[PDB]
Amino acid sequence: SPPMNDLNTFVKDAFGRPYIPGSSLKGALRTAILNDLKEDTKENEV
RNA sequence: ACGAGAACGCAGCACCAGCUGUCCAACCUGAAGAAGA
């Protein structure tokens, strides 16, 4: 109850519809599956 | 009054005929809108 100060926009393709782009899931799976090491962030085949 | 005088090395004739500037090759590689607004 503090009034709409500002509004955020989910990324949506040209047909209105929302979607989660590529490389966003890649960052998410980097923070997920990169639990092993902290060196392979550019050249890793995963 | 010259081993002399006179006498076009000249006439005709396509540097031309055939021939892919072609063949192979990804504008490609690596990269979160979070965060105490």
Rg (CA), chain A: 17
* Separation in Å, CA A3 to CA A6, A17, A27, A36, A41: 9, 26, 33, 44, 42
- Asked if A33 and A46 count as a contact pair (C-beta separation under 8 A), the reply is yes
Helices (H) and strands (E) in chain A, counts: 1, 0
Method by which the model was determined: cryo-EM
Residue with tokens 């060196």: A39
Strand B bases, protein C-beta under 7 A: 30-33, 37
How far is residue A32 CA from its own chain's centroid? 12
Nearest 10 degrees: Cα torsion A39, A42, A43, A46: 80
Residue with tokens 């050249």: A43
Planar angle of CA A14, A26, A35, nearest 5 degrees: 160
User: Does residue A28 lie within 7 Å of nucleic acid chain B, judged by its CB?
Assistant: yes
3-class DSSP state for residue A30? helix
Question: Which nucleotide lies nearest residue A43, CA to C1'?
Answer: B30
Q: What is the resolution of this structure in A?
A: 2.8
